[PDB]
């Protein structure tokens, strides 16, 4: 609902300002280091089944909230979550561009 609105806005951002729409954990982590994130979009599959990697995901979630961002956790039982999953399970809409990409 909010989930599908956010993901719509992600695809919109790819058209409107591509430098404010990233996917992939490395890109999204770089954007959070700059505190640039508007919304983090994450599949709950990524928490499901490896301690280090899961911890990396939980740090990211908490850190994004600490940086005045919003996190939206997607089920994978609709087309919306399935699509996020095709983008590696993590994406972000950025509030600001990150000049260093």
UniProtKB/Swiss-Prot annotation:
Tissue: Ubiquitously expressed.
Subcellular location(s) per record: Cytoplasm
Domain of life of the organism encoding this protein: Eukaryota
Family named by the database record: Belongs to the eukaryotic release factor 1 family. Pelota subfamily.
Function: Component of the Pelota-HBS1L complex, a complex that recognizes stalled ribosomes and triggers the No-Go Decay (NGD) pathway. In the Pelota-HBS1L complex, PELO recognizes ribosomes stalled at the 3' end of an mRNA and engages stalled ribosomes by destabilizing mRNA in the mRNA channel. Following mRNA extraction from stalled ribosomes by the SKI complex, the Pelota-HBS1L complex promotes recruitment of ABCE1, which drives the disassembly of stalled ribosomes, followed by degradation of damaged mRNAs as part of the NGD pathway.
Record text on subunit structure and interactions: Component of the Pelota-HBS1L complex, also named Dom34-Hbs1 complex, composed of PELO and HBS1L. Interacts with PINK1. Interacts with ABCE1. Interacts with CNOT4.
Name of this protein: Protein pelota homolog
Lineage: Eukaryota, Metazoa, Chordata, Craniata, Vertebrata
């Amino acid at each position: 609902a909010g989930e599908v609105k956010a993901l719509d806005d992600f695809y919109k951002m790819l058209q409107h300002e591509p430098d404010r729409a990233f996917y992939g954990l490395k890109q999204v982590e770089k954007a959070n280091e700059a505190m640039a994130i508007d919304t983090l979009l994450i599949s709950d599959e990524l928490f499901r089944h490896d301690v280090a990697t899961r911890s990396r995901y939980v740090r990211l979630v908490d850190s994004v909230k600490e940086n005045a961002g919003t996190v939206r956790i997607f089920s994978s039982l609709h087309v919306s979550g399935e699509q996020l999953s095709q983008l590696t399970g993590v994406a972000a809409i950025l509030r600001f561009p990150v000049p260093e990409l």
